[PDB]
Amino acid sequence: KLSEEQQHIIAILLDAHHKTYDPTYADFRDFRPPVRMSPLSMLPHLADLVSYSIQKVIGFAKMIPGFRDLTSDDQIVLLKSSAIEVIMLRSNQSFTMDDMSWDCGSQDYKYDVTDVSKAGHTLELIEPLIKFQVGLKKLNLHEEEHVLLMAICIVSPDRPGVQDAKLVEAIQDRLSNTLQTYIRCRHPPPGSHQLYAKMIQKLADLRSLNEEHSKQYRSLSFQPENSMKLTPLVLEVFGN
């Protein structure tokens, strides 16, 4: 059953997620406004959304027990490689299968396939991301499971350029054993059915969405006209 250290990890991750994820979406009013008629009329708004989301993921990451005790260089490698994947994960909280959209509280901040295509992304790559969101939504994760999964995603010891892979793996294993034990102790059947295995498969799916995005980003931003519509932080994190 769940130890005090495993309960403590969870408590920490919940607190971290709560302070970095406003389920009212009030800050979106400060983004460049959405335009749904440039042709990339949604790129300013969704670039802001991403950049805001990178900030938040970094605030969550810094709270993961042991992350701040890694070297700065390894912290930076882990965040650069995982940032899009944790954006994808955390977005699941607004995603709704009613319409296959991300519903952030109002018609202006509801994002569908079309909106994302007006940010420069092919329907072919957008489709796998919607399918991912559906599969993840179907898991019906407890908040505890959601946050642990975001954390396991960030402290992955296989990301290219990691120097202290063992230290990263020691963290991740503590999160992972916390997750397994939580599903077994607190998640009732049958929702718990192979739930750990399914969650870990989502991380593998996210590697694929990452790789595909990486190439598309490299194309979009290679164009100075598009890069100019991004933010400083997005350029720094995803590259120039």
Binding site: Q55, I58, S72, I76, L79, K80, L233, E236
Partner: peptide
């Protein structure tokens, strides 16, 4: 190569 902003958000 440098990550001034990401560094600052980690500090």
């Amino acid at each position: 190569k440098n990550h001034p902003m990401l560094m600052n958000l980690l500090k």
